Amino acid sequence: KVFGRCELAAAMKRHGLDNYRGYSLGNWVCAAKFESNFNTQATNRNTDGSTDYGILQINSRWWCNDGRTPGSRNLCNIPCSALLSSDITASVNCAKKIVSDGNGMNAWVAWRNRCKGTDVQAWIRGCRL
């Protein structure tokens, strides 16, 4: 599913991401934009042989099982394919664990390099929230 911007903002808010660990909703929407272009089906291989999955490009090195990332953990206890669903529940629940783990949203390279320190509120401007 390719979410609309406000559509995703509303789903993220419903699942409890607005100000989760102090990150305003626009941070999450911005992160999704530059990680996946709001496409739940996005997948991207990493050089280390892990793969990033879904709207927030969650990495199989630590967070989900894809059966082809040796030595990896599955800290969200899910198949990586669950992160590709039109229903973002699994992605959001896993993202909550990730962002709680000490480095916050710096976990997400696209957030650090494209969202952090910018006017992230622009990503929810106009949305009925």
Curated annotation (Swiss-Prot):
A Pfam family reported for this protein in Swiss-Prot or TrEMBL: Lys
Record-annotated active site: 35, 52
Domain of life: Eukaryota
Domain C-type lysozyme: 1-129
CDD domains cross-referenced by the UniProt entry: LYZ_C
Keywords associated with the record: Allergen, Antimicrobial, Bacteriolytic enzyme, Disulfide bond, Glycosidase, Hydrolase, Secreted, Signal
Keyword hit for Hydrolase: yes
Family membership noted in the UniProt record: Belongs to the glycosyl hydrolase 22 family.
Subunit structure: Monomer.
Miscellaneous note of the record: Lysozyme C is capable of both hydrolysis and transglycosylation; it also shows a slight esterase activity. It acts rapidly on both peptide-substituted and unsubstituted peptidoglycan, and slowly on chitin oligosaccharides.
Protein's name according to its UniProt entry: Lysozyme C
Source organism per UniProt: Gallus gallus
Chain's gene name: LYZ
